[PDB]
Design a protein around this ligand. Sequence first.
Ligand SMILES: [Ca+2]
Lengths: 56, 223
Amino acid sequence: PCCDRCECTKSIPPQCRCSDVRLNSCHSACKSCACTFSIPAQCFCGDINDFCYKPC
Amino acid sequence: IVGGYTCGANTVPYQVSLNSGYHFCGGSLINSQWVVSAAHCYKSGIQVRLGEDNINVVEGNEQFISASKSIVHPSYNSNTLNNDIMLIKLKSAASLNSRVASISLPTSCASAGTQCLISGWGNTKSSGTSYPDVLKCLKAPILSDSSCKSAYPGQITSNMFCAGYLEGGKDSCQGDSGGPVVCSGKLQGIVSWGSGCAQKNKPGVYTKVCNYVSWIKQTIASN
Ligand SMILES: [Ca+2]
């Protein structure tokens, strides 16, 4: 899985999210891929982690 | 703080360390019993450490006071980090002196170009990790919302601003969250989030304190 736009809070632990919006899918490691109900769907991963995935 | 400088002991007397097991966020003392920090810095067991410089050595000017009340902004949204502000009431009032002092709340908002002082014990490396013993400081300007929104499309609300340097190299970083952005002696920002630290084109994002002054005052008055 990869993420191009990763942002984190500046706390310890960091709380990071991938803000990538992708058509129809999120990255392969995403546990909560939130999509619009459009055609095509725009989706982004809601997961909060203490890391960023590598760039795509 | 990446690309900053050693402040000097107790030269930022309103800076506090929030400690719950370890230092995990900063905060700003706004009167003897209240600290402003980020909502995302809420954690169990917070001890507020005032008068710190070297957070790993008792130097003799510290006051360690347990947090007694957390008041996270009622509109804080962890999904967006909008309204990323929290008040912490100290269990007992801090003793205010040269080395422990409050910072004034703003009467008006700062805007692009305002020069500020950002401080904290956060990571000093943009790549990798190095955690300082002593407090670090960074002079940084507030940036145009155009630059801020361009850097973070769809994420910058009216309660945030960016500050720092688009060229990279100077920024707040992990461990700085909740800490102060002080501009002309007023607390205008709270370290909140960003894409990494000190990366080119990715300035730090900060909670816009001036939007919360009424809520802060009402909250302190009622709690
Ligand atoms: Ca100390």
